[PDB]
UniProtKB/Swiss-Prot annotation, chains A, B:
Tissue expr: Epithelial tissues and brain.
Protein modification: Autophosphorylated. Ligand-binding increases phosphorylation on tyrosine residues and promotes its association with the p85 subunit of phosphatidylinositol 3-kinase.
Family according to the record: Belongs to the protein kinase superfamily. Tyr protein kinase family. EGF receptor subfamily.
Function per UniProt: Tyrosine-protein kinase that plays an essential role as cell surface receptor for neuregulins. Binds to neuregulin-1 (NRG1) and is activated by it; ligand-binding increases phosphorylation on tyrosine residues and promotes its association with the p85 subunit of phosphatidylinositol 3-kinase. May also be activated by CSPG5. Involved in the regulation of myeloid cell differentiation.
TM segment ranges: 8-28
Tree of life domain: Eukaryota
Domain text: The cytoplasmic part of the receptor may interact with the SH2 or SH3 domains of many signal-transducing proteins.
Disease: Lethal congenital contracture syndrome 2: A form of lethal congenital contracture syndrome, an autosomal recessive disorder characterized by degeneration of anterior horn neurons, extreme skeletal muscle atrophy, and congenital non-progressive joint contractures (arthrogryposis). The contractures can involve the upper or lower limbs and/or the vertebral column, leading to various degrees of flexion or extension limitations evident at birth.
Organism, scientific name: Homo sapiens (Human)
Assembly information from the UniProt record: Monomer and homodimer. Heterodimer with each of the other ERBB receptors (Potential). Interacts with CSPG5. Interacts with GRB7. Interacts with MUC1. Interacts with MYOC. Interacts with isoform 2 of PA2G4. Found in a ternary complex with NRG1 and ITGAV:ITGB3 or ITGA6:ITGB4.
Name of the protein in question: Receptor tyrosine-protein kinase erbB-3
Length: 40, 40
């Protein structure tokens, strides 16, 4: 192992980030969306 | 013999995880705790 372990490690890091970002942007967006029935 | 970049990398991974977990457990917990609508 040396440079190949970067593939797995990279996926883990990216996975978490995408979750925190997606979840945050999704939750906040969803909440606001339902908040107002009219168009933005 | 050789482990330095693991420190920084470890922090990043742990940081994200803690966020996804804390945020999720906090948000869900908060919502359930005070399900009552907001007044502000």
């Amino acid at each position: 192992m040396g440079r190949t372990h970067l593939t797995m490690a990279l996926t883990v890091i990216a996975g978490l980030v995408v979750i925190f970002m997606m979840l945050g942007g999704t939750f906040l967006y969803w909440r606001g969306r339902r908040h107002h029935h009219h168009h933005h």
